[PDB]
């Protein structure tokens, strides 16, 4: 049993691998065409664009505010009954420093506005806030998978674990294709996608 | 995590760990060694774990010496592991309710540093096969439904029991069912590069 998709795939392994190829392919194009730099920074509109850009081919819900309730582990993400107003309040949150950018990122993860693909899209969106505001981007290879997922699970209660991780992984190489491309490979790895290397179209 | 091959990169250790242990999982089955071992004991679980990770981890098939936590859940304390595993061995396994309860306790014990999910799911299928003449068609269980049901299982095993019951197959000697199951088991832990049968 799995997520409804456009391509009518009924095998979990099959969907995981094809989603990874169509979406990482899109992620490569997003960076290379410079479409990435024309996107609105720190807003839901910007996140929505990143999400639709990646999952347009495989998912009907790509870039849309979900109409269903979702959860991971023992945590329920922002209920549909107030998800939209909660998103309007995230758009207004300041992003003037790391403590603020991390707090805003933690709230956007709680909102979790999409049916699936929240993690990957919100990590691209965060890197552009850090790029704009601190002239820093994350080197996702410096953060261990287990450490990241554990910090995010804790983040609705105390964001110090994820703050320390982002802080110690920040790099000044803001226009480096390798830092981005590797970060995409590490981002997908966090979500359990390990078949492709983004380098290849 | 420290490995035998001295791998420092996380992505590198992930695909090497997958290659090596999945090739071992294929050989475990194809040699028929899988059916030569003890069903429902820590001895059998320990054999399965050693068989999978003996090339990569020094701790393969060995009981952990450090305490572990997943979220706000603490697994069996290292000091009580020996006692807990002896009690699990004594747990009945006559029907699905008993088999699932045994599996749930074994997951709470989590006797190894790493690879509990993968080694215990193989162990579970062998208890199901011996006692019910059923095995799990793991594709019929969503990754996140499975993971959420496992995290819930110490409080209520209704969720995981429901997933296991609705995925039971009588294809006990089906190699394709076993192989697809290993690939899904590894995918549950985030390893999606290889197909076990292509090794
Ligand atoms: N239990 C949790 N509580 C809060 N955030 C979580 C939890 N588990 C995972 N996450 C976040 O959710 C992302 C996955 O996005 P998705 O697959 O759409 O749910 C991860 O990359 C984390 O940022
Ligand atoms: N919070 C949790 N509570 C109980 N069992 C869990 C939890 N998270 C994961 N698991 C189980 O742990 C396995 C992963 O094993 P390992 O990576 O060795 O710790 C999964 O396949 C689940 O069966
Ligand atoms: Ca996901
Ligand atoms: Ca490959
Ligand atoms: Ca070997
Ligand atoms: Ca060897
Ligand atoms: Ca693991
Ligand atoms: Ca492959
Ligand atoms: Cl995701
Ligand atoms: Cl595992």
Numbering used by the authors:
A (entry chain B): 7 to 207
B (entry chain A): 9 to 207
What does the paper say about this structure?
To gain further insight into the enzymatic properties of EfFIC, we solved the crystal structure of EfFICWT bound to AMP, used as a surrogate of the product of the AMPylation reaction. Electron-rich density was observed next to AMP in the active site, ascribed to a calcium ion present in the crystallization solution to the exclusion of all other metal ions. Ca2+ binds to six oxygen atoms, including a phosphate oxygen of AMP, the carboxylate oxygen of the acidic residue in the FIC motif (Glu115), and three water molecules, one of which is also bound to the inhibitory glutamate (Glu190), with the seventh ligand missing. The position of Ca2+ in the EfFICWT-AMP structure is shifted with respect to that of Mg2+ observed in other FIC protein structures in complex with ATP, raising the intriguing possibility that it may support an alternative biochemical activity. The nucleophilic water molecule is readily identified as the missing ligand needed to complete the heptahedral coordination sphere of Ca2+ in the EfFIC-AMP-Ca2+ structure, where it would be precisely positioned for in-line nucleophilic attack. Based on the observations that the α- and β-phosphates of ATP bind with canonical positions to wild-type EfFIC and that AMPylation is potentiated by mutation of the conserved glutamate in various FIC proteins, we propose that the primary role of this glutamate in AMPylation is to mitigate the efficiency of this reaction in the presence of Mg2+, rather than to fully repress it, possibly in order to match AMPylation and deAMPylation efficiencies. In the deAMPylation mechanism depicted in Fig. 5 (see also discussion in Supplementary Discussion and Supplementary Fig. 3), the conserved glutamate activates a water molecule for nucleophilic attack of the phosphorus of the AMP moiety of the AMPylated substrate, and the invariant histidine generates the free hydroxyl group in the protein residue by giving up a proton, as also proposed in ref.
The most frequent PTM reaction catalyzed by FIC enzymes is the addition of AMP using ATP as a cofactor, coined AMPylation or adenylylation. Enterococcus faecalis FIC belongs to class III FIC proteins, which are comprised of a single FIC domain and carry an autoinhibitory glutamate in their C-terminal α-helix. We discover that EfFIC has both AMPylation and deAMPylation activities borne by the same active site. Furthermore, the conserved glutamate implements a Ca2+-controlled metal switch that tunes the balance between these activities without conformational change.
